[PDB]
Every structure is written in structure tokens, then in C-alpha cells.
Amino acid sequence: GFRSACPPFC
């Protein structure tokens, strides 16, 4: 899945 669940990706 591709989602902005930081850390470390947003």
C-alpha cells in the first residue's frame, strides 16, 4: 500500500 504514514514518509 502507498500512504503517507510518517515517520518516515509524508
Side-chain angles (χ1 to χ4, degrees):
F2 296 96
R3 286 180 294 165
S4 304
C6 48
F9 295 114
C10 62

Short mmCIF file of all heavy atoms in Angstrom, two decimals:
data_model
loop_
_atom_site.label_atom_id
_atom_site.label_comp_id
_atom_site.label_asym_id
_atom_site.label_seq_id
_atom_site.Cartn_x
_atom_site.Cartn_y
_atom_site.Cartn_z
N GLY A 1 0.82 -1.22 0.00
CA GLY A 1 0.00 0.00 0.00
C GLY A 1 0.84 1.25 0.00
O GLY A 1 1.97 1.25 0.52
N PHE A 2 0.33 2.31 -0.59
CA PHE A 2 1.03 3.58 -0.63
C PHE A 2 0.24 4.65 0.07
O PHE A 2 -0.79 5.12 -0.42
CB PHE A 2 1.34 4.00 -2.05
CG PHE A 2 2.27 3.07 -2.76
CD1 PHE A 2 1.79 2.07 -3.59
CD2 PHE A 2 3.64 3.19 -2.59
CE1 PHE A 2 2.66 1.21 -4.24
CE2 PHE A 2 4.51 2.33 -3.23
CZ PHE A 2 4.02 1.34 -4.06
N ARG A 3 0.71 5.01 1.23
CA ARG A 3 0.07 6.01 2.07
C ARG A 3 1.11 6.81 2.84
O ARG A 3 2.20 6.31 3.14
CB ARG A 3 -0.92 5.35 3.03
CG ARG A 3 -2.20 4.87 2.37
CD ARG A 3 -3.15 4.24 3.37
NE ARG A 3 -2.61 3.00 3.92
CZ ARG A 3 -3.08 2.40 5.02
NH1 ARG A 3 -4.11 2.92 5.68
NH2 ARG A 3 -2.52 1.28 5.43
N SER A 4 0.78 8.04 3.15
CA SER A 4 1.68 8.91 3.85
C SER A 4 1.56 8.72 5.35
O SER A 4 0.89 9.49 6.05
CB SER A 4 1.41 10.37 3.49
OG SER A 4 1.48 10.56 2.08
N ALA A 5 2.17 7.68 5.83
CA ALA A 5 2.19 7.38 7.23
C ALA A 5 3.57 7.61 7.79
O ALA A 5 4.36 6.67 7.94
CB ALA A 5 1.73 5.96 7.51
N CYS A 6 3.89 8.85 8.03
CA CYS A 6 5.15 9.18 8.63
C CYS A 6 5.10 8.98 10.13
O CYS A 6 4.03 9.06 10.74
CB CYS A 6 5.58 10.61 8.28
SG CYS A 6 4.30 11.87 8.49
N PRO A 7 6.25 8.72 10.76
CA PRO A 7 7.53 8.64 10.06
C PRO A 7 7.73 7.31 9.32
O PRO A 7 7.15 6.29 9.69
CB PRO A 7 8.54 8.77 11.20
CG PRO A 7 7.85 8.19 12.39
CD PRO A 7 6.38 8.45 12.19
N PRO A 8 8.56 7.31 8.25
CA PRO A 8 9.24 8.48 7.74
C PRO A 8 8.80 8.86 6.30
O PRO A 8 9.65 9.17 5.46
CB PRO A 8 10.65 7.93 7.68
CG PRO A 8 10.46 6.49 7.22
CD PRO A 8 9.01 6.13 7.53
N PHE A 9 7.49 8.89 6.02
CA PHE A 9 7.03 9.21 4.66
C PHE A 9 5.74 10.06 4.64
O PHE A 9 4.64 9.53 4.80
CB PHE A 9 6.79 7.93 3.83
CG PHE A 9 8.04 7.13 3.55
CD1 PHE A 9 8.20 5.87 4.09
CD2 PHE A 9 9.04 7.64 2.75
CE1 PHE A 9 9.33 5.13 3.83
CE2 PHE A 9 10.18 6.91 2.48
CZ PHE A 9 10.33 5.65 3.03
N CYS A 10 5.90 11.37 4.50
CA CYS A 10 4.77 12.27 4.29
C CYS A 10 5.24 13.62 3.75
O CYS A 10 5.64 14.50 4.51
CB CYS A 10 3.89 12.45 5.56
SG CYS A 10 4.72 13.18 7.01
#
